[PDB]
mmCIF file of all heavy atoms in Angstrom:
data_model
loop_
_atom_site.group_PDB
_atom_site.id
_atom_site.type_symbol
_atom_site.label_atom_id
_atom_site.label_comp_id
_atom_site.label_asym_id
_atom_site.label_seq_id
_atom_site.Cartn_x
_atom_site.Cartn_y
_atom_site.Cartn_z
ATOM 1 N N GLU A 53 8.932 0.219 4.949
ATOM 2 C CA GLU A 53 8.280 1.114 4.000
ATOM 3 C C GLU A 53 7.152 1.879 4.674
ATOM 4 O O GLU A 53 6.882 3.027 4.317
ATOM 5 C CB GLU A 53 7.749 0.321 2.803
ATOM 6 C CG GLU A 53 8.837 -0.293 1.921
ATOM 7 C CD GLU A 53 9.434 0.685 0.927
ATOM 8 O OE1 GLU A 53 8.832 1.754 0.692
ATOM 9 O OE2 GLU A 53 10.522 0.381 0.374
ATOM 10 N N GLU A 56 9.028 4.753 6.141
ATOM 11 C CA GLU A 56 9.580 5.593 5.077
ATOM 12 C C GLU A 56 8.503 6.417 4.387
ATOM 13 O O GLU A 56 8.698 7.609 4.106
ATOM 14 C CB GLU A 56 10.292 4.733 4.030
ATOM 15 C CG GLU A 56 11.574 4.055 4.505
ATOM 16 C CD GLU A 56 12.169 3.150 3.436
ATOM 17 O OE1 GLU A 56 11.635 3.129 2.301
ATOM 18 O OE2 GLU A 56 13.185 2.475 3.723
ATOM 19 N N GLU A 57 7.367 5.798 4.074
ATOM 20 C CA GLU A 57 6.363 6.454 3.247
ATOM 21 C C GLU A 57 5.266 7.133 4.044
ATOM 22 O O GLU A 57 4.726 8.130 3.564
ATOM 23 C CB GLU A 57 5.732 5.450 2.271
ATOM 24 C CG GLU A 57 6.778 4.689 1.455
ATOM 25 C CD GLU A 57 6.194 4.003 0.235
ATOM 26 O OE1 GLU A 57 4.953 3.980 0.087
ATOM 27 O OE2 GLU A 57 6.990 3.508 -0.604
ATOM 28 N N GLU A 113 7.555 9.801 -1.124
ATOM 29 C CA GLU A 113 6.812 9.223 -2.237
ATOM 30 C C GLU A 113 5.385 9.738 -2.317
ATOM 31 O O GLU A 113 4.737 9.561 -3.356
ATOM 32 C CB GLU A 113 6.813 7.692 -2.154
ATOM 33 C CG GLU A 113 8.130 7.090 -2.637
ATOM 34 C CD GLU A 113 8.181 5.588 -2.442
ATOM 35 O OE1 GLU A 113 7.325 4.881 -3.030
ATOM 36 O OE2 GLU A 113 9.065 5.120 -1.684
HETATM 37 F F1 F B 3 10.827 2.872 -1.356
#
Side-chain angles (χ1 to χ4, degrees):
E53 293 278 344
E56 292 176 5
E57 307 196 352
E113 282 175 61

